[PDB]
Structure formats: C-alpha cells, structure tokens
Structure 1
Amino acid sequence: EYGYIVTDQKPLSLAAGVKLLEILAEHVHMSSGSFINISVVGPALTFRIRHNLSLADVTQQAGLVKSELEAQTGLQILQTGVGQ
C-alpha cells in the first residue's frame, strides 16, 4: 500500500511534492524523513511511511489541512487516498 496526493500540476515537481510532505509531517508531529519511498509521477505524489501513524491517518490529516497545504505550496489538491 502507498499514500498519494493528486495535484493540478502538469507535472508535479519533486521539490513541491517534498514541500507537501514537510508541511504534512509538521501537522502530524512526525519527522518528514519518516515519509519514505517518495515519487512524483505526472500530477501525483506517492509515498509510504516509516516505522514511527498509518497511511490512513496521514491521508485523513492531508484532507484536514488541505487549505493550508494549497496555500503554502501554490497548488491545488484534487485527490488524496491510498493505493495498492
């Protein structure tokens, strides 16, 4: 399983994807280095989480703070979820 965030960026930069994860990490009180196996592919950011909070927790939290994520990164978040 992996977490993902689909943005409006065509394509999403690696720098902006990591910025999303830094902000997300802060909101869940985890080190951003606990986001592992990160990739950007087209508009999407994908990631897993290291031993430390679950993917469910973090994608739920990404919804909770979506406004803040969008304002700080200058992009729009179109989907957040879990894949496998």
Structure 2
Amino acid sequence: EYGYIVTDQKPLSLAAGVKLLEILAEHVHMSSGSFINISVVGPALTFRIRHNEQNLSLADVTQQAGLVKSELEAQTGLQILQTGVGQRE
C-alpha cells in the first residue's frame, strides 16, 4: 500500500512534495524520515510509511492531510486536490 496527495502543480516538484511531507510529518508528530519510498510523478506525490513508535498508518496520515489541507496548502504554495491510499499486490 501507498499514500498519495494530488496537487494543482503539473508537474509537482520534488522540493514541494518533500516540503509537504515534512510539514505533514510535524503535524502528525512523527519523524519526516518515517515517510519512505517517496516519489513525485505528474501532480502526484506518493509514499509509504515505516513501522513507527507513534503507530500511525497510511490511512491515518492521508486522513490528517485532508483535515488540515488548508494549512498544508498555505505553507507549500500549492493546492491539494485529493488524498487517500492506493494498493497493488
């Protein structure tokens, strides 16, 4: 499974995707480093999450990203169109 955040940036810069993930991490009170397998493709930022002490899942992080999307946006200078969890087995 993976988490995703679709932006209004076509395409999305790595700097901006990573900046989003760091602001997001601090908002969920975890290490930035707990976000792994990070990519930006098209307007989309993807990632997975490491086994963390706080115990947040991808469901947890993507949910919170939608809840504070207004502060995430204004911090990063981009718009968040949608968030959620993808899966491929």
Question: How high is the TM-score relative to the length of structure 2?
Answer: 0.92
Percent identical among aligned pairs is 100
1:28-66 residue CA offsets vs partner (Å, 9 max, x unmatched) = 100000000000000000000001500000001101110
Secondary structure in structure 2 of the residue aligned to 1:17: helix
**Radius of gyration: which is bigger?**
2
Shift of 1:6: 0.2
Counterpart CA distance in 2 for 1:67 and 1:6 is 14
The residue aligned with 1:67 is 70
The residue aligned with 2:58 is 55
Structure 1: segments with no counterpart, 5+ residues: none
Task: Find out whether 1:23 has 2:20 as its counterpart.
Answer: no
Counterpart CA distance in 1 for 2:63 and 2:82 is 11
Counterpart CA distance in 1 for 2:25 and 2:60 is 11
Secondary structure in structure 2 of the residue aligned to 1:71: helix
Shift of 1:67: 0.3
RMSD: 0.7
